[PDB]
Amino acid sequence: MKKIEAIIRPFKLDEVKIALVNAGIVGMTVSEVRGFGRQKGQTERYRGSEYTVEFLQKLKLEIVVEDAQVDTVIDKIVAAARTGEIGDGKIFVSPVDQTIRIRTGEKN
Amino acid sequence: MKKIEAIIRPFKLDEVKIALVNAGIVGMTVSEVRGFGRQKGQTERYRGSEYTVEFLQKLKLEIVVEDAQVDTVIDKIVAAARTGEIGDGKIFVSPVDQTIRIRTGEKN
Amino acid sequence: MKKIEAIIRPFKLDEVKIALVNAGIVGMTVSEVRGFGRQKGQTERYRGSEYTVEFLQKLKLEIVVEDAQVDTVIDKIVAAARTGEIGDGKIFVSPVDQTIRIRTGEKNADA
Amino acid sequence: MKKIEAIIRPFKLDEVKIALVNAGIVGMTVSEVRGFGRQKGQTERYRGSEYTVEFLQKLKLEIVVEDAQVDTVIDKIVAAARTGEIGDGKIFVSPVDQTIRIRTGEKNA
Amino acid sequence: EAGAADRVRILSEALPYLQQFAGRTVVVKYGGAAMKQEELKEAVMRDIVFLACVGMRPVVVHGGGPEINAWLGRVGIEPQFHNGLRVTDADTMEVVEMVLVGRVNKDIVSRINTTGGRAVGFCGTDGRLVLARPHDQEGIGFVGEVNSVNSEVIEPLLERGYIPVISSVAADENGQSFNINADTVAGEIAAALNAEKLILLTDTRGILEDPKRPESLIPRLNIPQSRELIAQGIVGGGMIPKVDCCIRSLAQGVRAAHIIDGRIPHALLLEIFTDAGIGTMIVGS
Amino acid sequence: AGAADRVRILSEALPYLQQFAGRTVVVKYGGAAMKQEELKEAVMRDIVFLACVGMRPVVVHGGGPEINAWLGRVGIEPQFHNGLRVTDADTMEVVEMVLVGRVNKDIVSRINTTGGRAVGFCGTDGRLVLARPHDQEGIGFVGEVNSVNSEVIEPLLERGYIPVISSVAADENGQSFNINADTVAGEIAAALNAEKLILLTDTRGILEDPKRPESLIPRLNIPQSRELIAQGIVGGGMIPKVDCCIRSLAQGVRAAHIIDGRIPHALLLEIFTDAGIGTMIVGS
Amino acid sequence: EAGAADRVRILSEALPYLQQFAGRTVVVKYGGAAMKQEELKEAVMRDIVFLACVGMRPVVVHGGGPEINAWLGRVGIEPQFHNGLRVTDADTMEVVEMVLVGRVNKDIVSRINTTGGRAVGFCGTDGRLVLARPHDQEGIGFVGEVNSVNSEVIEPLLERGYIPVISSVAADENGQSFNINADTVAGEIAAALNAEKLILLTDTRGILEDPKRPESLIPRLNIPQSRELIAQGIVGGGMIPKVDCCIRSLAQGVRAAHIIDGRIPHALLLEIFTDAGIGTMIVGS
Amino acid sequence: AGAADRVRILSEALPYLQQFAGRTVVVKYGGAAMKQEELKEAVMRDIVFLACVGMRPVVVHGGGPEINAWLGRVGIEPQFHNGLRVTDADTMEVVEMVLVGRVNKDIVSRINTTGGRAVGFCGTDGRLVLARPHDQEGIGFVGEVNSVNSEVIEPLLERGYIPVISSVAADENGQSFNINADTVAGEIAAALNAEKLILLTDTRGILEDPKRPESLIPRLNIPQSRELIAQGIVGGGMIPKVDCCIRSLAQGVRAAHIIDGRIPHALLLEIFTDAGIGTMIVGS
Amino acid sequence: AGAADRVRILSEALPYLQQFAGRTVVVKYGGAAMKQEELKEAVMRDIVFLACVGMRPVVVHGGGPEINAWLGRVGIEPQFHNGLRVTDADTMEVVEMVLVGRVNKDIVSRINTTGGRAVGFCGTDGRLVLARPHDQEGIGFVGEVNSVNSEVIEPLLERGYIPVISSVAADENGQSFNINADTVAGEIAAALNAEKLILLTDTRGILEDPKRPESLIPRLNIPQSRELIAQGIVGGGMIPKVDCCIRSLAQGVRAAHIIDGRIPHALLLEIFTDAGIGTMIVGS
Ligand SMILES: CC(=O)N[C@@H](CCC(=O)O)C(=O)O
Ligand SMILES: CC(=O)N[C@@H](CCC(=O)O)C(=O)O
Ligand SMILES: CC(=O)N[C@@H](CCC(=O)O)C(=O)O
């Protein structure tokens, strides 16, 4: 089992969410995050201003997904979350051992 | 020489002012005043509410006028300042001995 | 006809008003005024502080009264409006020629 | 007995008060007033703006004075209260019958 | 039934008084009787914090002559009073401040805090809350009179539901400290705050129509009625300056002044929420 | 040398007064404390007292018995299907008229005369409550709470007003819906993040043994409540009442009280007294 | 020319520093050297009020061991200190409070007020500004340590341009008073206020790289560099707890801690607006 | 054991700093202190220092000499009629471009780089100043201040910004008017109820004797100013400059200063020093 | 029994009025709608109408053609290097004078007389826009937006004022820079988190097939737009205009509109009408 983490541009959240629900995803979590990654020496644009090394407002988006889904659900995210402009974000994939619903007890 | 004092309903001030300037009056002063006078036992209406003995917001209006004007300038005020509804106000006439402009010195 | 002007301490207004209506007065106007009429070389107390020459908050109270009433109407005011402490205020009496009610037209003058 | 009423420029109040206390005046009252005295079609200034007929902020200043003092008391006021610019104000003199101190009772009929 | 304490019924009966003085400001002179006796001292704090809790605005003003007396006899200085004020030189002044501002004030604050209020302790000199002048009385040393009160300091805290506790010690325009009478400060603070009530705790059941008769307690009297008693001699001793204080305070705007019997437990509550007579109320009439 | 010590007792209220100082309390005024004058008049006093002290009381109300009256005066017959009233288009019209018009403005009227400032509402006021058709099939225009927007009443609550809300809400279309009073109370309480949801009722609380009127449980959490339910101990229309509390507590509410509204001043006895008048259900 | 003093030119040169610390909060430990000597005492007040006037937010925290010492020898009690703290029983505590809260605190407030600021004097126990616990050190009586700081009381006043002056005396949850070290209180107040600078006035030209060499004054050192000196013995005596304080304070959020030579006139200004070395600045690195 | 005592001196500024703490100061930046770099750069520093300390400085500016340049670059000739510039429709266009465009944004630019936050305006911005045709006949689009509305700049002033206003205002129709800089300063100052109106100028103030560069009067009131004027002592284009002060002082302003803008840091010398750099005219 | 039933058509605007109620709109006023009076006068009325209703309109403007005039009146030739105008130190001075001085205050002047309260700005006012030298080498003092600080204008925006910003900004040193108008509009819009960035232009939008109007695409998203550049369909400068939109939309802006400023009341046509006047770029 795997944990997809998508650090995405604030406004995109809806476009991604709907894309995932359409792709049939059950449980997501979002958190407010500041981030940065710039080249190769480059500047990202945020609220009209150019920034080099300082942290900018983004959104960490966490789902846990069955191993086989990983490939095409990244495909679904990137498609929805991309502007092609500097600072679209990064996706991180990590292993997950166990998934417990608290209301029932269902372990996966 | 005489001092006309008109205690008038707040909104009327403009109608009175223009009436007096048209009647050819030079120097007026206004002050914010609370007042009351009720019958014969009656109730005046103010901001939707009925009042008996409590003070209500009005406007004291002070001019000084040449003795001969008095009669018809009261006529001009009352015409402009009347609604015919309880609490239109009162006019008071008093004697004035001397009138000094401060900017020049002109005494009347 | 006469115009009584009473410069009175802010809080007293009700006690005076009541006293005058009981004495049977119709016409009354109040205005917010700063004053000072102090005895030297003494000070007047206001909101906890001692003041000498500066203006303090008071209330001008204007009623127009028939010539005969003047004497005992002042008696009624002073009784109601006094604390006996420095800065109780001062009453002023002036002549009035004419009294016009705007809603009707009732002019008054005598005799 | 006489009642001097001075409608004066807001800022001047201190200069006038001073002048009167120095001239030896004991009782006095101020009230906030709007006024205007149309100077032959000309405009009066107030906070940077030109005004013709509208009411502007002033100060009514009331003292009651013994008949003999009237003349030179006005002289003291005008001197203190004048800028010479349009809208310095007006002084009004009226009769006063009686003066009662409330704390004591000292009448002046 | 099916139940034991109520209690609730008696609480519901406080409602009219609770409404009557809702959001009002009350300046209390905590002193002497209710200050020495623990049973009474602990009771006052619990009244003060209750008032605060309900939504009224209570302000404690305090002195502490007896409290001073102790420490003066521990630096080898002798107590002396001049027909009213405590005759205080430069050396004895230093002791007054230390006791009233340091030891007493923080005791009151400390208690309220532990009782569950948020007390903030002051003396005149704090943000020029009270500014002192030498008292008219000549020769009695650094005894002060209230020259001005500036509440710009404490009403912020009062809004925020804090309990100001003010000691009756104020500095002049130069920086020298002055021992001011506690009652007058209370009166002047009350006047400056436009307080609804000035309540003076005292070792007397109020003002008696007959000093010989303990049950002649006059319930109310206005200014003329009070001024009268001072001339007829009925109002005597050091009731005189106390009654003076009330009049002086009432004249300034205060709506009611109460001279209560601080000797009895929860004297404050019995005045505010009960019809039971614990002292004379003096109004502005 | 004096008589009434309402003082020593009021000083004893201080810890409770501090304990719930500034807190919000949603009360479901209904049935027992609503019909009997001596009690009805008592509640208003309690509500206004709470408000006066500095707590934030909110009255939510229904009035089945009250509706029953007027139906029988237009020639329509009362009709209940497992707790909720079978309300067609014609009977709905009456529900709305009684609850919003006659009952709500009685409660407001009383509080105002008692010395509080009551402001009366129903769900449809500024979309305070927005209704959906209740899951239950075929019982007509019976509603369930779809959403609560308190942007309307929060302002008034800060200004020390006492909101009184009837349990009638319009859907997105404009159709009125008869919603259960308790649930609305629970939902309002949840939306306001209330410290206490207090349900007035004709039962001394939740009895551990129905046969013994003395088993009265004092304190319960969610699992202990759910259990039984399952054990049958909680039965009848205590069940939806207990459901409500759980559903409300889950959402954020700190405490839910099912108290005996049948006894004078039931409220102040719960708030300021250790005396048992009902079961408290926590999230804890 | 045509004119004499300027003055103006030197004033215009303060602009970069004035901008640099504009609107910032500064907690100063007024004590010892700058407290006893008038020339210096009067100078500090004039610095404090200047800072306040400009738009910075200055907070005075004070002790007064020497000041205490006097009065204790006037009730027949003896001074005693345990390798740091002053060994204070129930009887000596009473004296500490009276001196620090009553006599010293109001002196500082009094001076500032006359200098043209608006000082408001506090001690820990005021609105639970500082709440004390018994200091870890066993057997040294009622010596306190800062258990918590609540600034909900003083930042209202700080916004309103007032000058808080806090004595280092705080009550516990029970109501008993505790003598807390002045420096730590300053540090903890500074931490709670998220202060830009914690400035400790002291009788030393700072931290010397060689104690034998008066001109080895280290200008800056971060936490590791400071912690080092404590092990190498260079930082010794009662510099140790002072340096401890700075570290403890800096760790909490404070941007800079200054150990300045309070012995020289206008020590504060020379630190804030001048490049001239008057002490060691310790940062959080 | 240390070197620069910029400390003992700054401690000496404290009384003045307290004296004008939070007060508003309208300065007419012009001519001498405007052309010479060493001075121009000095003014900005003074202005930003004042702002920094907590006073409220407002720069009002013109720039006759500055306009003269660009006119002679479109082939138009400078033309003055008794103080005011004879400005037709074509010359107006340049005035506006120079004062609002080139000069105003130089002053703002400098302040910003100096570390203040300048915000540049002209009369027509949010109707800050509204112009009427100047009483004077036939000198084209020369304006007089008809009204001042500070509802625009007050907000920024509180937020610690430094307004810089050019003396160009539009009438009710949209026509631009070249208004005298001094009068605008005076009017702005009056509208803001400013503590001080400070006019920078190429004169050491008002000399009691023109022949003696040392008679410098320190302090004058309105009657003493008007006099002379009448005695001829105040002459040239000091006359309208003195008129301005009187007109401004009459309206509420506490003090008007005619200082020698020719010397470095003329401003801070007036505010924080007892040294005479010009005549102060009071209403007193 | 009467006459102009313009009411029925007014009631029909309600859904759109609700749809952007309180939203912010940055409009690039330029070229076509700027030269022709009938169009110019129409825009102002649209802008003030928007403001009046409760939306927040911000005008950003350039004025190449306007600059061209005055350049040819100091004896300097216009020259363009693909899109940006090459501007030396001497030509910059003119740009600044024209845009900030003459054009900006024309727009402000008109709005004011139309009944709005316009407040005119350029980048350097309170550091609203701070410029850097544009990446393009050798083009003189042509600027690129380095940062936008709206702390200056959002106070005025809430107070119902209409900001009008010229596209001229100073660097950290004080040097003025000629920045492209569109980009400034985009970056202002981004900084304000604007609902709409609307670019007035002399084109009916983005034509699917240029051959070959009207094939104007109603809506595009970023990928669709990006592709059209590669396919050559989006050409000329179009290209930088479309770039602007993308760059602006990426930053947070919800919609960018390239509309035909050539037609009367182009703005209201876009906001309150379903009628196609340009291509809307989102978003998705
Ligand atoms: C559905 C339903 O039962 N509604 C309730 C109204 C509110 C209440 O419960 O009192 C009723 O009896 O009509
Ligand atoms: C009318 C007039 O003289 N305007 C001035 C502009 C402002 C100034 O005085 O500097 C000018 O010289 O054009
Ligand atoms: C670089 C550049 O294109 N500058 C434009 C200004 C922008 C505009 O007017 O829209 C110019 O014509 O100078």
Swiss-Prot record, chains A, B:
**This protein's UniProt keywords:** Nucleotide-binding, Phosphoprotein, Transcription, Transcription regulation
PROSITE patterns (UniProt xref): PII_GLNB_CTER (PS00638), PII_GLNB_DOM (PS51343), PII_GLNB_UMP (PS00496)
Question: Tell me, what is an example of a GO biological process annotation in this record?
Answer: regulation of nitrogen utilization
GO MF terms on file?
ATP binding; enzyme regulator activity; identical protein binding
Which residues are reported to carry the modification O-UMP-tyrosine? Answer: Y51
Query: GO CC annotation: what is one?
Result: cytosol
| InterPro entries, per database record | N-reg_PII, N-reg_PII-like_a/b, N-reg_PII/ATP_PRibTrfase_C, N-reg_PII_CS, N-reg_PII_urydylation_site
Tell me what PTMs the record reports for this protein. Answer: Phosphorylation dependent on the nitrogen source and spectral light quality.
Extract the SMART domains matched here: P-II
A Pfam family that the UniProt record links to this protein: P-II
| Residues with the Phosphoserine modification | S49
**Role of this protein:** P-II indirectly controls the transcription of the GS gene (glnA). P-II prevents NR-II-catalyzed conversion of NR-I to NR-I-phosphate, the transcriptional activator of glnA. When P-II is phosphorylated, these events are reversed. In nitrogen-limiting conditions, when the ratio of Gln to 2-ketoglutarate decreases, P-II is phosphorylated which allows the deadenylation of glutamine synthetase (GS), thus activating the enzyme.
**Record note on quaternary structure:** Homotrimer.
Q: Which PANTHER family match?
A: NITROGEN REGULATORY PROTEIN P-II, NITROGEN REGULATORY PROTEIN P-II HOMOLOG
Q: Which protein family is named in the record?
A: Belongs to the P(II) protein family.
- Tell me the protein's name: Nitrogen regulatory protein P-II
| Native organism | Synechococcus elongatus (strain ATCC 33912 / PCC 7942 / FACHB-805) (Anacystis nidulans R2)
Q: Which gene encodes it?
A: glnB
Swiss-Prot record, chains F, H, I:
Entry keyword set: Amino-acid biosynthesis, Arginine biosynthesis, ATP-binding, Cytoplasm, Kinase, Nucleotide-binding, Transferase
GO biological process, alphabetically ordered: arginine biosynthetic process via ornithine; L-arginine biosynthetic process
Instruction: Tell me which InterPro entries the record gives.
Output: AceGlu_kinase-like_sf (IPR036393), AcgluKinase_fam (IPR004662), ArgB (IPR037528), Asp/Glu/Uridylate_kinase (IPR001048), Glu/AcGlu_kinase (IPR001057), NAGK-C (IPR041727)
EC numbers listed for it are: 2.7.2.8
An example of a GO molecular function for this protein is: acetylglutamate kinase activity
Which reaction(s) does the protein catalyse, per the Swiss-Prot or TrEMBL entry? N-acetyl-L-glutamate + ATP = N-acetyl-L-glutamyl 5-phosphate + ADP
State the compartments where it is located: Cytoplasm
Amino acids binding substrate: G63, G64, R85, N178
* Family assignment from sequence similarity: Belongs to the acetylglutamate kinase family. ArgB subfamily.
Q: Which PANTHER family match?
A: N-ACETYLGLUTAMATE SYNTHASE, N-ACETYLGLUTAMATE SYNTHASE, MITOCHONDRIAL
The name under which this protein is listed is Acetylglutamate kinase
Gene name?
argB
